[PDB]
Structures are given as structure tokens and as C-alpha cells.
Amino acid sequence: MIRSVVIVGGGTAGWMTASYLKAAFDDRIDVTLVESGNVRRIGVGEATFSTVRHFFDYLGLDEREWLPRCAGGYKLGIRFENWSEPGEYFYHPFERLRVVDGFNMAEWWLAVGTSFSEACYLTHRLCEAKRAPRMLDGSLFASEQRAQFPYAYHFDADEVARYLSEYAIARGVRHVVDDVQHVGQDERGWISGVHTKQHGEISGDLFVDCTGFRGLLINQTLGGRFQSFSDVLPNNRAVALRVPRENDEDMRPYTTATAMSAGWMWTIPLFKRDGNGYVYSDEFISPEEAERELRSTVAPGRDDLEANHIQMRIGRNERTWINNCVAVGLSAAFVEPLESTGIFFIQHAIEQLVKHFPGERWDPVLISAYNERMAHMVDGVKEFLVLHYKGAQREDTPYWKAAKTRAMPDGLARKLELSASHLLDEQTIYPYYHGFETYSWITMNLGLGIVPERPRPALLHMDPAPALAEFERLRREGDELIAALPSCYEYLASIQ
Amino acid sequence: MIRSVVIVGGGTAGWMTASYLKAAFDDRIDVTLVESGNVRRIGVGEATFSTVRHFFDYLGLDEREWLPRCAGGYKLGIRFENWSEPGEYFYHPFERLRVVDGFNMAEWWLAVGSFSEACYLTHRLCEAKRAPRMLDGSLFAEQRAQFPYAYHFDADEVARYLSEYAIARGVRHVVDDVQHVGQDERGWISGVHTKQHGEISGDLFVDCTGFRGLLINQTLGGRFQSFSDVLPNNRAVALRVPRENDEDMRPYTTATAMSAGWMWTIPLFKRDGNGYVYSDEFISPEEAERELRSTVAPGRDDLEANHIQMRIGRNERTWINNCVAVGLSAAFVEPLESTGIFFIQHAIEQLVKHFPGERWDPVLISAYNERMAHMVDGVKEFLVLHYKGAQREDTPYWKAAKTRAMPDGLARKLELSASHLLDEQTIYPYYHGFETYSWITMNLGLGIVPERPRPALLHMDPAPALAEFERLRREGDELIAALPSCYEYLASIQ
Ligand SMILES: Cc1cc2nc3c(=O)[nH]c(=O)nc-3n(C[C@H](O)[C@H](O)[C@H](O)COP(=O)(O)OP(=O)(O)OC[C@H]3O[C@@H](n4cnc5c(N)ncnc54)[C@H](O)[C@@H]3O)c2cc1C
Ligand SMILES: Cc1cc2nc3c(=O)[nH]c(=O)nc-3n(C[C@H](O)[C@H](O)[C@H](O)COP(=O)(O)OP(=O)(O)OC[C@H]3O[C@@H](n4cnc5c(N)ncnc54)[C@H](O)[C@@H]3O)c2cc1C
Ligand SMILES: [Cl-]
Ligand SMILES: [Cl-]
Ligand SMILES: [Cl-]
Ligand SMILES: [Cl-]
């Protein structure tokens, strides 16, 4: 049985790990987290995926407690703007499709359908009317019912790290602020300790690499091989800003992904401000050009706002667990934030680390099974993301023209062939766990313009009444909800 | 749209198909079923899988209506006898494992704990021979998914019952032999030519002719892929054995390992169904008949034995041109996990979903074929796991099972399983009827057991899981005291 964990890095990954380990094992694990006082955290990572409520539940934290305290907001979905038709948009919401007489509402929409998201999802209305997912009395709008509309969150990246470090430290995590200068290895190549500038050697049984893109343990010490995805997903840089909203009250309960001339831009509404960034490929546009394009769109004349330029490491380690070291966060893998998966990868890496926790024997088969899961997790998203670029109909710049013909991962060709005939399902999407469900694959395809040539032939043999009564039911439930629900900001104000 | 379906074959496959199509499309589909008056149905296929309730629900039939009428009983799971330690047994039940603090009861059992007895309510119900219903008809536990119990029924009666259902709903019934299958200039089926009713044509043809594969294999040249290299059982001998005491009725199938295969016991309302599944490379058809009779029906030579040659494997494609194979014509594996009728149901459900329009869509058809292939391949792999987990080594047959070649992917599942339990991510990843608990339950019961408990559990409070084991033990106690016997309940609804 092993006793102690040493985490290197104090970004969102480090502090999520420290928190979760203490929540899981309490006093049956010793945890130390070492982080540099001079190497900054990435500074971004402000939108989350639908699994994140489980992370906070596991920690014993209600959203009323943790959300104001991370200066956050609600994420009901993502609004995709300008990807295909210009001025046009759709939502990818956190909401499962209803099923009528064996077929989901997407199939029926194609046969008897108003845009797809609008006809099929309550969430669409909530986004348009800028509603909170809760009534003022704190009851969920569905009124588990939380799974049927698995909304996520926006939060401030500084605050969440600050908040979780306090959570972890309150629970006995030893905190060291220092630079690791060298990582020791025993005669078998296993990590023996990390040598700091002022605190000597810090040893332990298990080491968690949370050093970001740098991969200081997993790559620079252990020689882990990093598999780049630049061949299919070229975006390799970002430029970020923190932009105050002219009107705080005007707060959207969703992230916006807006296609730009050489990439795309995020808008993440927080309680006090927006987060903004342009994800781009430097083969098509320079870092200044991108900064200029970004500022022009979301912050004209606001040169007091400092831009944060980021070089992204896109792809994954072949193995995120090597010897006694596990990489969590940007050190393990990263794909561009088009579907807000970075924090999801962290949560899933940590939840599966607890499941695959080593005993004094360090069982290689259990480690191997952990590595497979993490590989599948990222490869599924990678494929899902390439599908975004293949579905995007705009062709107006060298960038968008090149996205159309660029090589694809194995498997996607088949998914596109299928999709031109009929909708993807549980059996034809990526088959291993990667966060996303069928509705997400379908919703992107239909929003972007990858549509079956014709409706499902079976539906012509069937009574359309039950599905038409369902579309009407959705339309009426939507009407009632936007009338009864407070705004996104209103509800958040009431719980601050 | 297409208008008409012609089904060839009136076994369980033909009639399930006819029934389901009418249930699905009512008067928006014309259906004709043609079946031989002289080529007998297989005569077996008496246990079902957990999915089967959905088939009957879809048809609009409550179990109280259909079950006594098919002379059936309850299947709470399968009892595996003599597979590893001799005289030893365990249950593979239709019951999901409870989860405590992020780990299922199997994991906890390994850390703090027989397996089936500790983890499943169904184990007690089987031992005490209970019905899954109280006399007022309420379920013992929707709550139906948590304990997805299935059924036993008489194979003659179910065909008889479903043909009536379908015919009442406008299925045209023809009793004749198909002598020739016509094809058009594209190799599509144009009609079936019968001995006395001329040509019967339609848009879609469903091959329900059994192992024969009259349309899909003999006419269309579909290729059959054999599984004999990994699952050599190629024959069966069956009996219909009356129970000395009808009241003594088990709510489960028994799979008993024998010298050169295994034997099923399926308790029906009036009688048992019995059979020995074997490989003729290790035992002759009469040796097997002698071994069967000796075990379940000593001295009862008045009972006629049904000897069957099984075609084990699957068609590469079950849907070719305008013809879809359903049932034994499509695929078959030995009935060790009662999957034949499941394969039919799933084939038919997916046929409705993949139903063709007037414009035939090769991509939709290809997606149908992938699902049918995965369905059977998943079960194939799961069954080889039974033979690999069986620890008995007492005959040439059991010795050979130990070293026989395996399907791709199973070696990995066995390496994993010696380390820790299989899960949703490491079992066969495509739909094949079975869930994780089934894979786990078979491993633990047969004796493929992680070397040690999961190390994470040593860092955790065992109290919640121990309180759960106790809760299960107490709920079990209460259920066997309150539930009527399997026979008692069935008697009350006859
Ligand atoms: C442009 C961009 C946009 C993103 N958007 C999203 C999003 O919308 N949603 C989402 O979920 N994710 C997003 N991500 C991912 C998100 O930022 C990360 O998942 C999250 O911030 C965790 O980062 P990290 O902890 O792994 O790395 P970092 O923040 O880089 O942390 C590295 C830590 O290691 C420390 N360190 C480095 N070297 C040493 C050393 N020598 N000794 C001691 N300490 C050391 C540093 O001091 C720091 O504490 C985005 C990423 C990028 C690049
Ligand atoms: C030994 C054994 C045990 C089994 N146990 C189980 C079990 O426990 N549980 C389970 O779910 N499944 C079991 N199965 C499978 C089960 O028997 C079948 O799934 C089910 O009976 C359906 O069979 P079928 O309709 O495909 O074939 P068949 O019963 O053989 O039907 C063939 C039909 O085609 C007709 N036909 C053939 N040729 C012509 C022609 N020339 N013209 C007109 N009609 C023709 C015949 O008349 C007949 O109606 C078992 C199978 C075997 C062999
Ligand atoms: Cl489905
Ligand atoms: Cl991300
Ligand atoms: Cl899990
Ligand atoms: Cl079977």
C-alpha cells in the first residue's frame, strides 16, 4: 500500500488533483503540492463540460457555494457562429434528445419539421432569452433531472485555482512554493524525488506531473513520447484577453465559438467580465494579425487591455502514466478548446487515477488499462473536432479552403459517408469513452450542414402525430420556461 | 415507400418477424408468410434473454396474457453447474450490480467479502425457487430494468401463438414448399415459386428458413463464416422430459458441464426441456444420447430424442440485395447464454429502424450489416470466455478447450481480468446484448479472479459497502419469505 503523492504544478490540474485525492482518501493519503512562484499558470481555461458537476459533488461542494466564489456563470451549451452560412448560428446544448416511437427528435425533425436546435431542444430558448437554469428558489428548471439537462459552467481561471488550493490546504495538503530544478531517478528510471531551489529534495511514492505543456516529469525526465495532432488539427496558437462587459447584467448562459478568418474565437461570459480568445494557426496568420483581428472584434480602442499570447502543444502523450509518474492536464494532452475539454480531461484523468490507484506492487496491467482509457479519451475528441472543420461550410480564406481538403483521422471518412445517408448513433460514433454522447455528434452535424440526403424511410410508414405533438409540447414548455425563469445574471446576483 | 414483405419460414423467427412488422407499421405494410407443411421447425429454443419483455410490450402483450398461453415459466438467470470445481455452481442472474462510493459490489466483494450469493438478490430467489412477482402481480423490486428477468416457454406454443397474433392482424399465410427462388437481371429476388400456389412476389424478402439459408445462402451466394475453430460444439440431442413433480419448478435455466459439452435444463409449466450440446469430435451422437438419458431420464425410452446438426457462425452479411436473413439462417452460436431469440428480436428491431425506402440505400444496409455482425461477434467472444474460465480438465474435451485458439481481443481481456475486473471500457465495445456485470459474473463464478483486490479500496472506508452487503442479505431474507413459488404464481395466472 502506497502512502504519499507529490504533485508538481499549481494550475487548475495540480489543485483539482490535490483536492480530489483528499476527497477520495482523506487521511489515508499524504499529499504535497510544489509549484513555482515565478512560472505563471496558463491563465486561461474558463468553460467546462457536462461532467464537471460530479467533480464538485464529490468534493462536497454545492454550486451555490463554489460558483460565486469562482466568479462564474452558467454554460447551457455552445453557440457556433459564422461557421457555414455567414451571420448564421446554432446551439450545441447540454440536453438529451427525446425519443418518440423508437426514433429521436432529430430523425423526426428531418421527416416532419424552425432550425434543428430550436425545434428539438428546450435549451435553445433558454439561451436566446438568456435564462438561468434555476428558479430564484434554487429549483432546477427540469422540475436525476440534472442528467437530462447536464448544464456546465464558466468560471474565472485565477479564482478556481485560488479556491481549490484553499480547499486542498484546509484538508492537509502540504503546499510548497518553489522551483523544481532537477528530478531524481533511481536505478530503474523511477522518480525518486524532485529537487527544489530552497526546500531540498521532496520525495514520495507517486508523482503527478501538472507542469503544463512543459511536461517536466513525463516528457523531459521520463522521455515520454508526445504524439502531435497538427497534421489534422493545425491550430497551434492563441491570443487571449479579459474584456469587461459594458453591461454586466447582459450575461449569456453559454460560450460562443465564432469562426474567424484563420481560426475561431471564444467568448466566455463570467460574473464580472468576459473571457475572449482567438485560436489560430500561424501558418495562415501572424500573432499580431490575430491580436489585431481579435481586438477589432471584441475590444475596439481598448489598448489598456493586455493580450496573453499562448503557444499550444496539441496532441497527447503515448502514455500519460509511466513508472511512478502520471501526467494530468496540459502535460498529458491538449486539443484546441473548441468543445471545452481541457478540464474534462483533468477530471477524468483524476477519477480514473483513483480507480487505477496503485498498491505497493505497481501492477503494469492496471497501469496499461489506465493508459488506454486516456488515449481513447483524447482520440475520441480529436476525431469529433476534425468533424467540426469538415462540417464548416465557409470557404472564404486560405485557412477555410485548406480545412476542407486536409487529411482526417482514421474512422472519420466512414462517419461522414454514414452521415450523408442517415444519422450517426451509439454504434457509429467513436465507441470508447470520450465525454461526448450521440446527441452531440448529431447536433454538430445538423448545425454545420452535414445532413442526410433524405429522411429515414421507416418514418414514412409511421404515424407522424405523436412526434408532432412532441414538437408542440417542446415549443410550449419553452414558452413557459422563459416566462418563469430569471435571467442568468439575476439568479447569480441572488446567490452572491 | 416499399409496400410488401414476403417471409419464408414459420419457425420462431418467421412469426416474430411477421408479428413485429404488423405491430410496427400496421396497415402501412403488406405481409405474407410462406412455410412448409412438411419441413419441421427446429423444435427447440425455449429460453430467452432479458431484452425479450420489450418485444412483447411492443406487440401490446402483457406477460399474464402470453406466458400461460405459451406454457412458459420464469428465467431469473442461469445456474452453471460443474464447470470448474465438481458439484460446484454459481448463478449468472439478470440483476445489475449496486455501486458504493464509486465501486461496484464485485470490487468490494474482492476486498471485504460466494460472489453471486453476496452480491445479487436473484441468487436467493433462485435457491428458494421464488416467482419474481407477488400474488397481486406486483414486481418484487423502471424497476423492471434493475432486475431484467426473462422467460422460458414451449417452442411449439410460441410459434402457434404468434402466428395467430400476426394472422389476426392481416398477415397472409401460405402453407407450401418454395421450390425455386426467382431472381431479376440484377440478382435481386423477384419471387418465390411454390409447389401449389404459384409465384409469390414482394419488395422485401425475409429469409427465415433456418440453417438451410435458402435465400441468403443457397440463392444469393452469401458467405457463411464458421466459428468451429474457437467453438467446436456442432451437434445437440434434445428431449422433452416431464417433471415428476410439476410444483417443483425452478425459475432459472441450468447449464451443466458434461464430459464432452454441456446440458441445458429449461423448466416449463408442464415439463422440462433438456438437451446435450456437444462436439462430435469428442463423443458420438449415440454416446451423447446415452449420457443425456442417463442423467435426466433413466429408463424412459418412450421419450423420442431429437438429434440436431448445428450451423455455428454467421453470414458475412445478413442483408444482401432485397433479402434479410433473420434467425438461424442469419447466424447461430450454441445456446449457452440463450441468445438465439435475442438475435431474432434485435435483427427485427433493427430492420424496422433500417427499413428501406423505394430508393434502396447501400449505406443504411451496410450499417445494418455491421450491427448484426457485432451482435454475434460479441457473443462469440463472451462464449469462448466460458470455456476459458472453466477450470475442469478431466476429459480430452476439457483439456482441448484449455488450449484452443481464441478470437482476437480475448487474450487481452484475460490478461486484464487476472489483474482487475473488466468494465464498460474493456468488454466487447459494440452492442451484443450483454453488459459489464455479465462479463464480470462469469469470470468470478468460473474462477478468473483478480490476483488481489483493487488497491484503491485499502485507502477507503469499508463501512458503506459492508452495510450494503448486509442490506442485500436482509432484503433477500424478506423477499423469499414474501414471494410465492415459481409454480404457485404461474398457477394463479393460468
Ligand atoms: C488557449 C487555451 C484555451 C483553453 N481553454 C479551455 C477551456 O475553455 N476549457 C477548458 O476546460 N480548458 C481550456 N484550456 C485548458 C486549461 O487551460 C487547462 O486544462 C487548465 O488550465 C490546467 O492547466 P495546467 O494546470 O495543466 O497547466 P498550467 O496552468 O500551465 O500550470 C503549470 C504549473 O506548473 C508550475 N511549474 C512549471 N514548472 C515548474 C517547476 N520547475 N517547479 C515548480 N512548478 C513548476 C507552474 O508554476 C504552474 O503552477 C485551454 C488551454 C489553452 C492553452
Ligand atoms: C439445439 C438448439 C437449442 C437452442 N436453444 C435455444 C435457447 O435455449 N434459447 C434461444 O433463444 N434460442 C435457442 N436456440 C435457437 C432457436 O431454436 C431459434 O432461434 C428459433 O427456434 C428460431 O429458429 P428459425 O425460425 O430461425 O429456424 P427453424 O425453426 O428451423 O424454421 C425453419 C422454417 O423454415 C421453413 N422452410 C424451410 N425450407 C422451406 C421451403 N423450402 N419452403 C417453405 N418453408 C421452408 C420450415 O418449414 C420452418 O418453418 C437453439 C437452437 C438449437 C439448434
Ligand atoms: Cl437504436
Ligand atoms: Cl479545452
Ligand atoms: Cl467507472
Ligand atoms: Cl441460443
Buried b (16+ CB within 10 A) or exposed e, B124-158: bbbeebbbbbeeeeeebeeeeeebbbbbbbbbebb
A1-496 architecture in CATH? 3-Layer(bba) Sandwich (3.50)
* A416 close contact with B: CB closer than 8 A: no
CA distance A280 to A263: 4
Partner-chain contact B28 A462, CB within 8 Å: yes
The CA B96 to ligand 5 mean position distance, Å, reads: 14
Backbone angles phi, psi at B406, to 5 degrees: -120, 155
**Side chain identity at residue A70, one-letter code:** C
**Atom 31 of ligand 2, residue of closest alpha carbon:** B11
- For the Cβ of A444 lying below 6 angstroms from any atom of ligand 1, the answer is no
With H, G, I as helix, E, B as strand and everything else as coil, classify residue A49. Answer: coil
Q: What would the grid cell of residue B202 be?
A: 414482394
* Cα separations in angstroms, A339 against A65, A77, A441, B21, B388: 26, 10, 12, 41, 43
Partner-chain contact B455 A376, CB within 8 Å: no
**Ligand 2 pocket test target in B42, B162, B215, B256 with most atoms within 8 Å of CB:** B42
The CA B345 to ligand 6 mean position distance, Å, reads: 12
Chain B, 283 to 342: residues with Cβ < 8 Å from chain A are none
Q: What would the grid cell of residue A341 be?
A: 475539454
Our CA dihedral for B160, B163, B169, B172, rounded to 10 degrees, sits at -140
- The residues facing A140 across adjacent strands are A134
For residue A37, give the DSSP letter.
S
CA distance A356 to A350: 10
Partner-chain contact B419 A29, CB within 8 Å: no
Task: Give the Cβ contact number of residue A68 at 10 Å.
Answer: 15
Closest C-alpha to B95, from B45, B141, B37:
B141
Partner-chain contact A457 B356, CB within 8 Å: yes
8 A C-beta contact, residue B376 and residue B433: no
With H, G, I as helix, E, B as strand and everything else as coil, classify residue A284. Answer: coil
The CA A420 to ligand 3 mean position distance, Å, reads: 18
Q: What would the grid cell of residue A139 be?
A: 429549483
Mutant choice from B448, B459, B460, B461 vs A, greatest count of A C-beta within 10 A = B459
CA distance A156 to B11: 65
- Rounded to the nearest 5 degrees, what angle is found at the Cα of B204, between the Cα atoms of B200 and B208? 80
B341 assigned ligand-binding residue: yes
- For the Cβ of A459 lying below 6 angstroms from any atom of ligand 1, the answer is no
* Nearest CB partner across the interface for A354, out of B28, B415, B456: B456
8 A C-beta contact, residue A91 and residue A123: yes
User: Grid cell 473571457 — which residue?
Assistant: A275
- For the Cβ of A5 lying below 6 angstroms from any atom of ligand 1, the answer is no
Q: Longest C-alpha distance within chain B, in Å? A: 76
Q: HSE on the CB side for B335, CA within 13 Å?
A: 30
* A433 close contact with B: CB closer than 8 A: yes
CA distance B357 to A459: 10
**Side chain identity at residue A494, one-letter code:** S
CA distance B27 to B21: 10
Q: CA of B416 to nearest chain A CA: how many angstroms apart?
A: 6
Q: Which ranges of B147-284 would DSSP assign to H, the alpha helix?
A: 155-168
B363 assigned ligand-binding residue: no
Q: What are the start-end ranges of the E strands in A440-484?
A: none
8 A C-beta contact, residue A53 and residue A64: no
How far is Cα of residue A336 from the mean position of the Cα atoms in its chain? 9
A50 assigned ligand-binding residue: yes
Ligand 2 nearest-atom number relative to CA B326: 26
Q: CA of A299 to nearest chain B CA: how many angstroms apart?
A: 46
Resolution in A: 2.4
Task: Give the Cβ contact number of residue A244 at 10 Å.
Answer: 12
* Nearest CB partner across the interface for B425, out of A426, A432, A456: A432
* Nearest CB partner across the interface for A25, out of B24, B354, B459: B459
Residues of A in contact with B419 (CB under 8 A): 363, 365-366, 369
- For the Cβ of A215 lying below 6 angstroms from any atom of ligand 1, the answer is no
With H, G, I as helix, E, B as strand and everything else as coil, classify residue B35. Answer: strand
**Atom 50 of ligand 1, residue of closest alpha carbon:** A45
CATH, domain range B1-494: 3.50.50.60
* Nearest CB partner across the interface for B364, out of A358, A366, A422: A422
- For the Cβ of B374 lying below 6 angstroms from any atom of ligand 2, the answer is no
Chain B, 64 to 103: residues with Cβ < 8 Å from chain A are 102-103
Task: Give the Cβ contact number of residue A162 at 10 Å.
Answer: 14
Ligand 2 nearest-atom number relative to CA B41: 29
For residue B96, give the DSSP letter.
P
CA distance A212 to A310: 12
* B186 close contact with A: CB closer than 8 A: no
Q: What would the grid cell of residue B333 be?
A: 452460436
Residue B165 CB partners (closer than 8 Å, separation 6+): B15, B19, B59, B61
CA distance A154 to A45: 9
Partner-chain contact A28 B361, CB within 8 Å: no
Partner-chain contact A366 B420, CB within 8 Å: yes
8 A C-beta contact, residue B204 and residue B32: no
Q: Which ranges of A257-315 would DSSP assign to H, the alpha helix?
A: 287-298
The CA A177 to ligand 3 mean position distance, Å, reads: 53
- Closest chain B residue to the Cα of A423, Cα to Cα: B364
Enumerate residues preceding breaks in chain B (C to N > 2.5 Å).
113, 141
- For the Cβ of A8 lying below 6 angstroms from any atom of ligand 1, the answer is yes
8 A C-beta contact, residue A183 and residue A222: no
**Ordered DSSP codes for B132-168:** SB-TTS-B---HHHHS--EEE--HHHHHHHHHHHHHH
Q: Distance between terminal CA atoms of chain B?
A: 43
- For the Cβ of B46 lying below 6 angstroms from any atom of ligand 2, the answer is yes
Q: What would the grid cell of residue B144 be?
A: 423492471
How far is Cα of residue B54 from the mean position of the Cα atoms in its chain? 14
CA distance A128 to A74: 14
* B60 close contact with A: CB closer than 8 A: no
User: Grid cell 488506454 — which residue?
Assistant: A372
CA distance B344 to B366: 18
Residue A447 CB partners (closer than 8 Å, separation 6+): A80, A90, A91, A92, A116, A117, A391
8 A C-beta contact, residue A482 and residue A125: yes
**Atom 47 of ligand 2, residue of closest alpha carbon:** B36
CA distance A335 to A389: 14
| Residues of B with catalytic roles | 75
CA distance B465 to B107: 10
- For the Cβ of B335 lying below 6 angstroms from any atom of ligand 2, the answer is yes
Pair type for strands A30-35 and A174-177: parallel
B275 assigned ligand-binding residue: no
H/E stretch holding A182: strand A180-185
Backbone angles phi, psi at B489, to 5 degrees: -65, -45
* A57 close contact with B: CB closer than 8 A: no
Residue A469 CB partners (closer than 8 Å, separation 6+): none
Residues of A in contact with B28 (CB under 8 A): 461-462
CA distance A47 to A13: 14
Q: What would the grid cell of residue B190 be?
A: 423477384
CA distance A431 to A427: 7
With H, G, I as helix, E, B as strand and everything else as coil, classify residue B100. Answer: strand
CA distance A344 to A335: 12
- For the Cβ of B8 lying below 6 angstroms from any atom of ligand 2, the answer is yes
Partner-chain contact B455 A358, CB within 8 Å: yes
How far is Cα of residue A106 from the mean position of the Cα atoms in its chain? 24
**Atom 2 of ligand 1, residue of closest alpha carbon:** A44
* Cα separations in angstroms, A419 against A34, A428, A439, B367: 48, 10, 13, 11
Ligand 1 nearest-atom number relative to CA A42: 29
* Cα separations in angstroms, B337 against A20, A106, B79, B193, B439: 41, 35, 11, 37, 12
Residues of A in contact with B455 (CB under 8 A): 1-2, 357-361, 363
- For the Cβ of B42 lying below 6 angstroms from any atom of ligand 2, the answer is yes
Closest ligand (CA of A330)? 1
Partner-chain contact A366 B419, CB within 8 Å: yes
Q: What are the start-end ranges of the E strands in A49-164?
A: 73-75, 77-81, 89-93, 99-100, 103-104, 152-154
